[PDB]
């Protein structure tokens, strides 16, 4: 379900973080 | 993993979009 996201300066977009990437 | 996430300037973090 809902997950924590971080901003990727490399991809210029928000990506999810699940203890692996 | 359904709705899109974007950077919120108000919260200074990535959040989910609305609308359904």
């Amino acid at each position, epitope marked *: 379900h809902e997950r*924590s*996201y*971080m*901003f*990727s*300066d*490399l*991809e*210029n977009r928000c*990506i999810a*973080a699940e*203890a*692996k*990437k | 993993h359904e709705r899109s996430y974007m*950077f919120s300037d108000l919260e*200074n*973090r*990535c959040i989910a979009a609305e609308a359904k």
Partner: antibody
Amino acid sequence: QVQLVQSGAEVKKPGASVKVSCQASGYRFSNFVIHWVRQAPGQRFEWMGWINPYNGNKEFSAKFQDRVTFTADTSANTAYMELRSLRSADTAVYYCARVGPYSWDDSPQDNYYMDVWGKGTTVIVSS
Amino acid sequence: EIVLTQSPGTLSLSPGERATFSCRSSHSIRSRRVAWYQHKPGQAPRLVIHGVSNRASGISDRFSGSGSGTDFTLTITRVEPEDFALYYCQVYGASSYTFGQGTKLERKR
């Protein structure tokens, strides 16, 4: 205080493998991710990947994902990096570094900088 | 990949002088995940700044990080002999951990 002690210098022939250890003290080993970074003579520091000692989860740089192995022994507060199929370009100083602490309201990986570094382990690869 | 370019290559200064290190990124770093490190030959690198402007524990106020977007800077108000080294900038988090080539803070005589 927070300390990271690495294993001694190594010398290997091309094609072989090397395993470097990083022993931590001064903090809760299972609460912090550990990065592995190297620096070859005349080259820029090069990130290799990280490992979460608690669950063994990890992330690899595309450059080493196929031949590097990250492991951890929580009962010994030690993290290991094994690089296989060694080549001349692998001659370098290999460092382990602990990530920084975090606050409940930060964003993911805001603390993923190299907070504390080990002094590095020299690895020489030559025929 | 994100590419970081540091300037100048070498910084020759005498104790007491102001040191200004520059670091240019290929991508805009909106996350502010930028750090600066100090490295003395033969010793473990040391974190100086994280999050662009947060001074690492044990770091003197004479050190200060700043910048935004594509241009970041490390400044030492008054250079002390203990400061001569190598200084590196780096972006971290979200699968991007590239470092700049470094700037050597050398003592002028």
